[PDB]
Structures are given as C-alpha cells and as structure tokens.
C-alpha cells in the first residue's frame, strides 16, 4: 500500500490466450501478410497455403 | 438512294458478335475490378485502424 512513481522496475509477463483466426479469403491473408511482425518461417510457404486454414496463435507478452 | 433500291442493314456493332459468352466475360471483368479495389481499400482501412 502506498503511492509509487518508480516505473523502471515495473513489468508484466502475460501468457496470452491461445487464439485462432481462420483465413477464409485471400483478403484475410493479405491483411495478415501486411504485418511486419507476422514473420513467416518457411517464407517459401505460399500465401494460400494458409487459405482456408485456421491459424493458431501461441503468444507471450512482456 | 440505296434504300430506295432495297432495304439496308447497317451493322454498327463494332464486332461484339464475335465475342463468345459476353455475359460471363462481363461478369468476370466486373469482378476483377472489384477485387483489386477491395484489396487496396481493405489495406487502407486497416492502415487507418
């Protein structure tokens, strides 16, 4: 209990919900591949490799 | 003067009669426009959001 203004040691580790998104359309995948943070692994994997797929997202946020 | 000889049939169609399945072609091209438009618009809207 108290008033604290020291933010230098403040952090939060969160295991995010295992989320799902289904890429029914090219548009969804273009939307996805717009994201620079969406770093494809095997980049030679086609965009429409993901077409009609539910991508599952396991994420941690610090 | 020619019409006084015989009825005249003037084809001013520009060759449309030589295109098979004009309706399907038209429907496809109307789609082609729309897709391209939508993609840029979706990117724009997402960029805004």
């Amino acid at each position: 209990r108290g008033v604290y203004t020291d933010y230098e040691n403040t952090f939060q580790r969160k295991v995010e919900t295992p989320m799902q998104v289904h890429l029914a359309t090219t548009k969804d995948i273009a939307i996805l591949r717009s994201k620079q943070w969406f770093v494809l692994d095997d980049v030679a994997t086609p965009e429409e490799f993901l077409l009609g797929k539910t991508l599952t997202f396991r994420l941690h946020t610090l | 003067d020619l019409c006084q000889n015989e009825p005249v049939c003037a084809d001013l169609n520009g060759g449309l009669q030589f295109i098979p399945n004009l309706n399907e072609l038209m429907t496809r091209e109307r789609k082609n426009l729309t897709e391209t438009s939508e993609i840029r618009q979706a990117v724009t809207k997402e960029t805004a959001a």
Side-chain angles (χ1 to χ4, degrees):
Chain A
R1 296 181 294 167
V3 179
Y4 296 87
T5 51
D6 49 313
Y7 290 97
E8 62 274 17
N9 294 306
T10 61
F11 70 93
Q12 181 180 11
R13 288 175 180 129
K14 188 178 173 218
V15 181
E16 302 289 358
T17 302
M19 285 292 282
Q20 275 183 347
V21 176
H22 182 89
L23 298 163
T25 73
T26 56
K27 173 179 176 180
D28 313 315
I29 339 178
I31 282 162
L32 178 56
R33 293 174 72 254
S34 78
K35 310 294 177 165
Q36 294 199 349
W37 48 256
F38 177 71
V39 177
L40 281 159
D41 307 328
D42 173 1
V43 187
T45 306
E47 176 176 280
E48 293 178 47
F49 194 97
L50 323 172
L51 181 65
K53 308 304 178 182
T54 305
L55 288 185
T56 292
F57 301 74
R58 294 184 186 143
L59 299 173
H60 298 79
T61 283
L62 172 60
Chain B
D1 188 58
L2 181 62
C3 297
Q4 299 176 12
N5 295 265
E6 57 183 4
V8 178
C9 181
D11 186 342
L12 312 179
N13 192 24
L16 280 148
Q17 69 269 37
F18 300 113
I19 295 182
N21 296 359
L22 181 62
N23 185 344
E24 295 180 338
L25 184 147
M26 285 280 288
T27 298
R28 185 181 64 200
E29 297 312 318
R30 188 177 289 262
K31 198 185 180 183
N32 299 336
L33 298 170
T34 306
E35 303 155 336
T36 311
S37 165
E38 274 197 55
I39 292 154
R40 282 178 169 177
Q41 287 163 343
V43 166
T44 302
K45 181 171 183 177
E46 172 156 48
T47 305

